[PDB]
């Protein structure tokens, strides 16, 4: 393997962390290949669930608890902290909230959250690497509570970062928010990609094509697919009651990705930095409710 930049995996990984049996588990948690039979039964389809009132309540709660756990991780971002140590704290924080860490064993993913540094686009595996001053790191949290998943991420600065890092991070956040601002009933899912690319391109950045936002509720990934690039052919039209994520990955160089030999970590083929933000949204009559918003602070962590 020829690495595309300066990052390398830092092994060994800690043995798989157990989740106490009193915590309710999703179907794939005990499948040997981490396959989800409830998602596989729906691979056929592009039909979107209209959430019941009970489902909405279940989504509001798991997304609020997922925000709480992202904020714990945000608190830990400084030089010299390993991404495994951030994962360990996330794992205890989910169990404290009587939730299962949705990524753990999902398709045999080995950890409880994803930590993506610098040229990593997404799905980085927490490992022994201490964070370095100047890094940008994304922490991607998903919890499962009472049958529902809630998904969100932010990119953070490690100590002082360069001007390029600040611009990439700010533009990525603005891409996400301008796409959120367009959500309301009757808009096509395929439109959000136009909005995101337009703003990335205006700032000289590119949009990852290989990874998309997704419906989420009783399944971790389900309809609709929500691409983040322009002129995509996503199927579907937003209606009140729909829940899904928007999770744009934007890059300093070109948009092309590849995957490390570990089968998970996705990296820019050119080795340049990529940043991401994600929220889980519910469509309402007046636009949408950001289920994974902060309730007690106006801005994402990188602004503070």
Cis status of the peptide bond prior to 75, with omega within 30 of 0: no
229 is a contact residue toward ligand Y10 (CB under 6 A) = no
151 is a contact residue toward ligand Y10 (CB under 6 A) = yes
Tell me the residue number closest to Mn ion, measured at CB. 140
Question: What is the smallest separation between the CB atom of 133 and ligand Y10, expressed in angstroms?
Answer: 26
93 alpha carbon, distance to own chain's centre: 18
Give the nearer residue to Mn ion in terms of CB position, either 101 or 133: 101
**How far apart are alpha carbons 215 and 48 in whole angstroms?**
8
Of 194, 207, 278, 283, the one binding ligand Y10 (CB under 6 A) is 278
109 is a contact residue toward ligand Y10 (CB under 6 A) = yes
Question: What is the smallest separation between the CB atom of 142 and ligand Y10, expressed in angstroms?
Answer: 5
Residues lying near Mn ion in the complex (CB under 5 A):
140, 151, 153, 245, 278
Question: What is the smallest separation between the CB atom of 212 and Mn ion, expressed in angstroms?
Answer: 9
Of 91, 214, 217, 218, the one binding ligand Y10 (CB under 6 A) is 214
Measured from the Cβ of residue 194, the count of other Cβ atoms closer than 10 Å reads 18
Environment class of 80 (CB within 10 Å of its CB; exposed 0-12, middle 13-18, buried 19+):
exposed
The verdict on whether residue 214 carries a ligand-binding annotation is yes
The verdict on whether residue 247 carries a ligand-binding annotation is yes
Question: What is the smallest separation between the CB atom of 91 and ligand Y10, expressed in angstroms?
Answer: 14
73 is a contact residue toward ligand Y10 (CB under 6 A) = no
Out of Mn ion, ligand Y10, Na ion, none, what residue 120 binds, judged by CB under 5 to 8 A for its kind, is: Na ion
232 is a contact residue toward ligand Y10 (CB under 6 A) = no
221 is a contact residue toward ligand Y10 (CB under 6 A) = yes
Question: What is the smallest separation between the CB atom of 80 and ligand Y10, expressed in angstroms?
Answer: 25
Stretch that binds ligand Y10, among 21-29, 77-85, 102-110, 279-287 (CB under 6 A): 102-110
Question: What is the smallest separation between the CB atom of 225 and ligand Y10, expressed in angstroms?
Answer: 6
Tell me the residue number closest to Na ion, measured at CB. 274
Is the distance from CB of 175 to CB of 248 less than 8 angstroms?
Answer: yes
What Rg value do the Cα atoms of the chain yield, rounded? 18
Stretch that binds Na ion, among 25-33, 56-64, 109-117, 177-185 (CB under 5 A): 109-117
Out of Mn ion, ligand Y10, Na ion, none, what residue 112 binds, judged by CB under 5 to 8 A for its kind, is: none
Question: What is the smallest separation between the CB atom of 286 and Na ion, expressed in angstroms?
Answer: 34
Output the known binding site for a protein.
123, 221
- Name the residues that contact ligand Y10, by CB under 6 A: 103, 106, 109, 114, 122-123, 140, 142, 151, 211-212, 214, 221, 247, 278
């Amino acid at each position: 393997y020829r690495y595309t930049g300066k990052l390398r995996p830092h092994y060994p990984l800690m043995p798989t962390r157990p989740v106490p049996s009193y915590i309710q588990r999703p179907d794939y948690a005990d499948h040997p290949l981490g396959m989800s039979e409830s998602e596989q039964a729906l691979k056929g389809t592009s039909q979107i669930k209209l959430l019941s009132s009970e489902d909405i309540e279940g989504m509001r709660l798991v997304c609020r608890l997922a925000r709480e756990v992202l904020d714990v991780a945000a608190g830990m971002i400084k030089p010299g902290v390993t991404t495994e140590e951030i994962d360990h704290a996330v794992h205890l924080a989910c169990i404290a909230r009587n939730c299962y860490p949705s990524p753990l064993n999902y398709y045999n993913f080995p950890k409880s959250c994803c930590t993506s540094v610098n040229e990593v686009i997404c799905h980085g595996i927490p490992d022994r690497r201490p964070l370095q001053e100047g890094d940008i790191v994304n922490v991607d949290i998903t919890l499962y509570r009472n049958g529902y998943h809630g998904d969100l991420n932010e990119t953070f600065f490690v100590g002082e970062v360069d001007d390029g890092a600040r611009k990439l991070v700010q533009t990525t956040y603005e891409c996400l928010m301008q796409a959120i601002d367009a959500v309301k009933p009757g808009v096509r899912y395929r439109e959000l990609g136009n909005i995101i690319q337009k703003h990335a391109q205006a700032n000289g950045f590119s949009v990852v094509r290989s990874y998309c936002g997704h419906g989420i509720h009783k399944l971790f990934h389900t309809a609709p697919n929500v691409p983040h690039y322009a002129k995509n052919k996503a199927v579907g039209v937003m209606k009140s009651g729909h829940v899904f994520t928007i999770e744009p990955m934007i890059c300093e160089g070109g948009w092309q990705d590849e995957t490390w030999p570990d089968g998970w970590t996705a990296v820019t083929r050119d080795g340049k930095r990529s940043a991401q933000f994600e929220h889980t949204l519910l469509v309402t009559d007046t636009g949408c409710e950001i289920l994974t918003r902060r309730l007690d602070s106006a801005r994402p962590h990188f602004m503070s």
